Amino acid sequence: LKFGSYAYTRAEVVYEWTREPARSVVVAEDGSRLNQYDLLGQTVDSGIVQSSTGEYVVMTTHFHLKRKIGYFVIQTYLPCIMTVILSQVSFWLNRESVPARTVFGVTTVLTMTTLSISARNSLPKVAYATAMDWFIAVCYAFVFSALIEFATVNYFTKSQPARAAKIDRLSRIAFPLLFGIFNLVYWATYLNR
Amino acid sequence: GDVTVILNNLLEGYDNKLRPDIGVKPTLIHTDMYVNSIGPVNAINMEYTIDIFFAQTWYDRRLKFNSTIKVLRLNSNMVGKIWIPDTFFRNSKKADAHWITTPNRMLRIWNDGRVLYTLRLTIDAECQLQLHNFPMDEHSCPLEFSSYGYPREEIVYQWKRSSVEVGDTRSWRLYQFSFVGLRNTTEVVKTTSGDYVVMSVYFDLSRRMGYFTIQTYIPCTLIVVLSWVSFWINKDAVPARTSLGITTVLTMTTLSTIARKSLPKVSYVTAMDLFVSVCFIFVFSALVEYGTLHYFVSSQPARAAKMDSYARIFFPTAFCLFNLVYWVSYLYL
Amino acid sequence: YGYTTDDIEFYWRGDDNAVTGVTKIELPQFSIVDYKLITKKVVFSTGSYPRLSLSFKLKRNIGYFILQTYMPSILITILSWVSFWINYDASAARVALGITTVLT
Amino acid sequence: MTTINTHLRETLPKIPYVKAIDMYLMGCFVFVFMALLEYALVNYIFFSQPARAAAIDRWSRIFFPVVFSFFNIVYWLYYV
Amino acid sequence: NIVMTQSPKSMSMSVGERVTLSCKASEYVGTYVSWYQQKPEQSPKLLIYGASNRYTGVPDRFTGSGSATDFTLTIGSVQAEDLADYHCGQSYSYPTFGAGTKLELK
Ligand SMILES: *[C@@H]1O[C@H](CO)[C@@H](O[C@@H]2O[C@H](CO)[C@@H](O[C@@H]3O[C@H](CO[C@H]4O[C@H](CO[C@H]5O[C@H](CO)[C@@H](O)[C@H](O)[C@@H]5O[C@H]5O[C@H](CO)[C@@H](O)[C@H](O)[C@@H]5O)[C@@H](O)[C@H](O[C@H]5O[C@H](CO)[C@@H](O)[C@H](O)[C@@H]5O)[C@@H]4O)[C@@H](O)[C@H](O[C@H]4O[C@H](CO)[C@@H](O)[C@H](O)[C@@H]4O[C@H]4O[C@H](CO)[C@@H](O)[C@H](O)[C@@H]4O[C@H]4O[C@H](CO)[C@@H](O)[C@H](O)[C@@H]4O)[C@@H]3O)[C@H](O)[C@H]2NC(C)=O)[C@H](O)[C@H]1NC(C)=O
Numbered sequence A: 001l002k003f004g005s006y007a008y009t010r011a012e013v014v015y016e017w018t019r020e021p022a023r024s025v026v027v028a029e030d031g032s033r034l035n036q037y038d039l040l041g042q043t044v045d046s047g048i049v050q051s052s053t054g055e056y057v058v059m060t061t062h063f064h065l066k067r068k069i070g071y072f073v074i075q076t077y078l079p080c081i082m083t084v085i086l087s088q089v090s091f092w093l094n095r096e097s098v099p100a101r102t103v104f105g106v107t108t109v110l111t112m113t114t115l116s117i118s119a120r121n122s123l124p125k126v127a128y129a130t131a132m133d134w135f136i137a138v139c140y141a142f143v144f145s146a147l148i149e150f151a152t153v154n155y156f157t158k159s160q161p162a163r164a165a166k167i168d169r170l171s172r173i174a175f176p177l178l179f180g181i182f183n184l185v186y187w188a189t190y191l192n193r
Numbered sequence B: 001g002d003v004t005v006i007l008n009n010l011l012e013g014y015d016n017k018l019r020p021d022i023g024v025k026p027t028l029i030h031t032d033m034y035v036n037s038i039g040p041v042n043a044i045n046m047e048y049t050i051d052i053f054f055a056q057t058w059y060d061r062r063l064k065f066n067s068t069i070k071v072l073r074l075n076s077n078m079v080g081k082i083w084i085p086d087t088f089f090r091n092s093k094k095a096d097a098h099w100i101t102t103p104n105r106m107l108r109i110w111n112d113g114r115v116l117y118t119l120r121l122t123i124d125a126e127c128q129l130q131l132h133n134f135p136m137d138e139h140s141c142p143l144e145f146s147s148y149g150y151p152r153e154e155i156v157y158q159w160k161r162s163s164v165e166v167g168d169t170r171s172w173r174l175y176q177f178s179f180v181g182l183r184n185t186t187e188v189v190k191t192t193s194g195d196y197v198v199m200s201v202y203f204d205l206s207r208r209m210g211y212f213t214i215q216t217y218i219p220c221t222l223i224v225v226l227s228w229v230s231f232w233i234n235k236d237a238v239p240a241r242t243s244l245g246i247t248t249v250l251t252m253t254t255l256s257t258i259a260r261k262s263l264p265k266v267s268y269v270t271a272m273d274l275f276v277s278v279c280f281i282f283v284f285s286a287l288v289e290y291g292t293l294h295y296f297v298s299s300q301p302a303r304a305a306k307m308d309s310y311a312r313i314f315f316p317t318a319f320c321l322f323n324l325v326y327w328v329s330y331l332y333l
Numbered sequence C: 001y002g003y004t005t006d007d008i009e010f011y012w013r014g015d016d017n018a019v020t021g022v023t024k025i026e027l028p029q030f031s032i033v034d035y036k037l038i039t040k041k042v043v044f045s046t047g048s049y050p051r052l053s054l055s056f057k058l059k060r061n062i063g064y065f066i067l068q069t070y071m072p073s074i075l076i077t078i079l080s081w082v083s084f085w086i087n088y089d090a091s092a093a094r095v096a097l098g099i100t101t102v103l104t
Numbered sequence D: 001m002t003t004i005n006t007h008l009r010e011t012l013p014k015i016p017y018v019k020a021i022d023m024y025l026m027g028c029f030v031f032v033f034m035a036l037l038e039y040a041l042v043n044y045i046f047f048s049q050p051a052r053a054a055a056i057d058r059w060s061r062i063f064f065p066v067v068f069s070f071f072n073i074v075y076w077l078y079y080v
Numbered sequence E: 001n002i003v004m005t006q007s008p009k010s011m012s013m014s015v016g017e018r019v020t021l022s023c024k025a026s027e028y029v030g031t032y033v034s035w036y037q038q039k040p041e042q043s044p045k046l047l048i049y050g051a052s053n054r055y056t057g058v059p060d061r062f063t064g065s066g067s068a069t070d071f072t073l074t075i076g077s078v079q080a081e082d083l084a085d086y087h088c089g090q091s092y093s094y095p096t097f098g099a100g101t102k103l104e105l106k
């Protein structure tokens, strides 16, 4: 929150804090209309603005906000994890139930697309990719890999059923462990920031 | 005070209704502009926001004064007492000055009668975006201004080499566009009330394809590959294949509908629409491939298997080829 | 508002080139077919007043709507016919296809 | 369940904590997901002794309504 | 309570060359760090008010800088008059001074 004088330069009007700068911006204890943010504190500074019309005093205040994650957890991360697990459970399913596994895969992928598109609209249309975007992308990759695994099982079955059994049994434990490793890595690399 | 006496003398017998040199020669106004920020460029309303510090300098013979004070530095209190040019922005949907805590206006008067008058403005300028090539489209659209009631014979505007300067450009609100640069222009425009000197500043904006990539290009590609995954499925499970195809089609259709909504409803096709329609054709072609296979298996299964393998080996190559063609075509031109 | 036809009379200054810029106008969804300038007097209980009317004819650009709405409709109702080519023995495929077309 | 939750989400603002309607919606989604898992489980032991799969199905047929009713009683007594 | 650690505690650097005094703050004190000069048996004299602003009638060899917690005072060329104790203090909060560093020639 920068403010200063229009039309009066440092040589004519200067600004200063009434009391100690640390105690000069006071926030009412009960006054907080933030919903998804937490106000950690405020910081003040005084400086100069260099302008074609002269040098002006600018008084600066910074309000430090840390975003609350509960809503985003509930609306994106827990749904995404649940969709991943819903795609995973197909491995325990019967191989002979080809329509069942196909329905699971296609519905899960559609569900990941709808969560992706619904999660992107909440934040502004920035060009770069956010952390939630990476989480959504990796979850999408996991569900899509589960679909590819089912496709490979259905391709092998009736030709090399031993290979189909081996690949399905291996995936049953490879996918959950990889998802857990990715979850731990992501949460560590972002929360501890 | 001395300045009080000077200001009293200046305003005595002063008619702010009449411009300087009314019956003599056009009043030459020099204009500068500090582009504080170029706000969001929303194409739905076909406009963009810009925050500027507009400065205007002219000479007023009536404001000459002899004293050791070389410049009278004043606040907005005097803005309405002296004559001020009636500059307005011709392509502004809506603009307003700033009024907190007081009017954000400055006024400086020199010995020789020169007047400098700056103010802070935010303008919702309107410029038509030719959304062909979107979201690869590049735009360069203006902020025009002129005197409302004074034709060229009475008010003339003139730029300066360093008239238009830009801020840091990192805090600007442009998310899907990048500020390539700006150029200025002056011309005369014929109007019902006469000819007016119209001054223009063009801001060249290049779109960022990064966001729309994530929004639409990746999802459409991955739905297309989802449609591909049908071919490797066993031919026997008809409900499996039908459900996969229809789910891909529905997701593709809803994705197309939502993706277009990001764009103003225009009657012409955009580069974005073409890629989406190509992916939609690809999924429809996969559905038709499975349907033809289902009809042809009854007559003979060997041909069905042969054509299924051919489709499996072809479709990815066809999609890659069309991607290359589209991307090169719309990046070159 | 306050002046009747005994006090004020309106007319178009030129009567043909009184309204300008209609050709240069551009709309995302409409095309201006033409415009008309009308002069008349409207009577209220308070008196009679001069009325000018400027009217535009706007025609909707169908091109957007065709692809946006009709094309998904045309397709969906075409795929709905695929059920015919499938043998009636396979109930699941045909039923799913028809019913999902209805949902779409 | 997903669509009902999306319709609820659009109306309300972004709030960190969890609302009562949110608790009910998680409960109901848990029930649906558990039914799906039960179906997958009975399918898994389908090739094995079908008697066990039938017994599991019979257990579910009576427990799921009962457990859902108990959950409804608890939820509605807590919030009233 | 912001604690201003001032180092080095003393200096015996040769006359005529550059002197660098570095003052560090425990917490954020935006630009409210000042440098005072205290010649022996005499009251302190203000040299730098705010960060990187010189007080009236101060030799131009003195110049300071610093943003959040790292502030320094630089002398272009020492003089016989510069043999004094220098203290850095912050005024962002209730004032606290640094330990002060003595300047010596040899
Ligand atoms: C249909 O009806 C509509 C509704 O009535 C009508 O709109 C109104 O039009 C009038 C006239 O056009 C407007 O009045 C003018 O307002 C100008 C500023 O406009 C902005 O601000 C006002 C709000 O005004 C408050 O805040 C301003 C900002 O500082 C103050 O200047 C005001 O005093 C006032 O402050 C009070 O209110 C505060 C909070 O409400 C309080 O906290 C505070 O304590 C005060 O009590 C807004 O309403 C405007 O918004 C509207 O307009 C914009 C236009 O783009 C729209 O976009 C928007 O949507 C809104 O519609 C806008 O934001 C004033 O500058 C102006 O007054 C000057 O000019 C007149 C004319 O000459 C003088 O009489 C007057 O004295 C002023 O001149 C002095 O001041 C200037 C500095 O500005 C000096 O340069 C000058 O030399 C002169 O100084 C001398 O006199 C001084 C005495 O004032 C003295 O102190 C000096 O020492 C010196 O001697 C004028 O008042 C009105 O705001 C519109 N309202 C609305 C709602 O639109 C519309 O036009 C009608 N349509 C038609 C077709 O007729």
Ligand SMILES: *[C@@H]1O[C@H](CO)[C@@H](O[C@@H]2O[C@H](CO)[C@@H](O[C@@H]3O[C@H](CO)[C@@H](O)[C@H](O)[C@@H]3O)[C@H](O)[C@H]2NC(C)=O)[C@H](O)[C@H]1NC(C)=O
Residues within 6 Å of the ligand: C034, C035, C036, C038, C040, C053, C054, C055, C056, C057
């Ligand atoms: C849009 O709607 C308006 C209003 O309905 C149309 O204006 C109408 O224009 C016709 C032709 O100019 C008018 O007819 C005239 O009536 C007078 C009455 O004395 C007669 O003397 C003339 O010979 C002529 O027949 C009609 O009055 C007028 N409507 C109203 C309410 O004034 C307009 O044509 C429509 N289209 C466009 C493109 O504006």
Ligand SMILES: *[C@@H]1O[C@H](CO)[C@@H](O[C@@H]2O[C@H](CO)[C@@H](O)[C@H](O)[C@H]2NC(C)=O)[C@H](O)[C@H]1NC(C)=O
Residues within 6 Å of the ligand: B159, B160, B161, B182, B183, B184, B185
């Ligand atoms: C802004 O307008 C000024 C004045 O019209 C332009 O200044 C000219 O700059 C060129 C350099 O390319 C010089 O050769 C001319 O002599 C300048 N003219 C004057 C009158 O000084 C300036 O180029 C414009 N900036 C743009 C278009 O970006």
Ligand SMILES: Cc1ccc(-c2nc3ccc(C)cn3c2CC(=O)N(C)C)cc1
Residues within 6 Å of the ligand: A004, A005, A006, A007, A049, A050, A051, A052, A053, A056, B032, B033, B034, B036, B053, B054, B055, B118, B119, B163
């Ligand atoms: C053509 C022109 C150029 C600059 C100004 C101007 N006048 C001021 C007065 C005060 C303050 C804080 C900023 N001002 C600015 C803009 C500026 O220089 N910024 C933002 C760094 C006005 C007109």
Ligand SMILES: Cc1ccc(-c2nc3ccc(C)cn3c2CC(=O)N(C)C)cc1
Residues within 6 Å of the ligand: A074, A075, A078, A079, A080, A082, A083, A086, A111, D002, D005, D022, D023, D025, D026, D029, D030
């Ligand atoms: C408050 C709330 C409730 C439910 C959801 C939700 N939406 C989905 C969509 C899809 C899939 C697979 C799972 N979903 C879940 C699961 C969930 O969040 N649980 C179990 C706590 C989101 C927010």
